[PDB]
Amino acid sequence: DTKEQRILRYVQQNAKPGDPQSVLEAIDTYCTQKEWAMNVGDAKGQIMDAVIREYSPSLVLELGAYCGYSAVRMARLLQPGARLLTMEINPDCAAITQQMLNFAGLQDKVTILNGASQDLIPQLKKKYDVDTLDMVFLDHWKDRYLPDTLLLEKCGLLRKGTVLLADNVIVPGTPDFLAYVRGSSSFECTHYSSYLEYMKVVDGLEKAIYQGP
Ligand SMILES: Cc1ncnc2c1ncn2[C@@H]1O[C@H](/C=C/CNC(=O)c2cc(-c3ccc(F)cc3)cc(O)c2O)C[C@H]1O
Ligand SMILES: [Cl-]
Ligand SMILES: [Cl-]
Ligand SMILES: [Cl-]
Ligand SMILES: [Mg+2]
Questions:
Q1: Is 171 in the pocket of ligand 1 (CB under 6 A)?
Q2: What is d(CA 201, CA 146) in angstroms, rounded to the nearest whole number?
Q3: CA–CA gap between residue 27 and residue 30 (Å, rounded)
Q4: Measured between alpha carbons, how far is 126 from 128 in angstroms, rounded to an integer?
Q5: What domains are defined for the chain?
Q6: Closest CA to 153 of 141, 139, 136
Q7: Which of 67, 130, 162, 174 is in Cβ range 3.0-4.6 Å of 158 for a Cys bridge?
Q8: Please, what's the b/e burial string for 167-194 (b: 16 or more CB within 10 A of its CB; e: otherwise)?
Q9: Is 188 a catalytic residue?
Q10: Residue of 141, 151, 199 with the most ligand 1 atoms within 8 Å of its CB, for mutation
């Protein structure tokens, strides 16, 4: 088995079904005590929670589910009727994420799309009946943040006021994306300093609010 499967099993052996907080705590405990993994973690997760509560988005897109930790984090704070779409290229991770959400009781709020973001993004309008996104959480391969931001715009999926929230803008970093949004008159940017998941290493989230063309 894989580390990802081991995290899911620990949740199944240690958390309460239908209790998102107990799922998050179990993941954090496993990744602190047993094996590190690239979940967004509790430090940055608390910032994410405060941003999601502030904006109360009706439709969120996540790029890069991994094991579903961030999807559980976000979905548990969505207002009734609001929804999350999460894209995950690795079929094993897509299935783990679906199972994590099922365990947490959040499955009716989330759609887990198994595929590459650059292939799925152009299908959101026609196949998934999306108009525009209220929020986008970027947490996939770091060289894809900028290409996918540009693709989202091309596809008409951003509106004035869409909130981009990007993980890992310090470590590993996403230098092209970060320079681009910070230099662009089409984004208003704010940096939230924090810590790499499960580590005493500085990281941060970037909030980049789209201003329109
Ligand atoms: C194109 C595309 N479409 C859909 N899913 C995609 C995708 N590219 C990746 N994915 C999925 O996102 C996930 C991957 C994300 C990449 N994230 C990382 O590489 C990552 C790495 C670190 C890190 C920090 C310090 C260190 F010393 C070592 C590592 C920390 C993090 O928080 C991360 O998100 C899983 C993958 O299948
Ligand atoms: Cl995560
Ligand atoms: Cl790819
Ligand atoms: Cl943490
Ligand atoms: Mg990350």
A1: yes
A2: 24
A3: 5
A4: 6
A5: 1-213 (3.40.50.150)
A6: 136
A7: 162
A8: bbbbeeebeebbebbeeeebbebeebeb
A9: no
A10: 141
Mode of pairing for the β-strands spanning 110-114 and 83-88: parallel
What token pair was written down for 3? Answer: 């580390």
- DSSP class per residue in 159-211: EEEEEEEES-IIIII-HHHHHHHHH-TTEEEEEEEEE-TTSSSEEEEEEEEE-
**Short-list 36, 33, 10, 34, CA closest to 23:** 10
- Proximal ligand: closest to the CA of 47: 4
The yes-or-no answer on residue 197 being catalytic is: yes
Say if residues 157 and 80 touch (Cβ distance below 8 Å): no
Q: Could you tell me the resolution of this structure in angstroms?
A: 1.2
Ligand 1 atom with minimal separation from the 201 CA:
25
DSSP secondary structure letter of residue 89 = S
- Catalytic annotation on 125? no
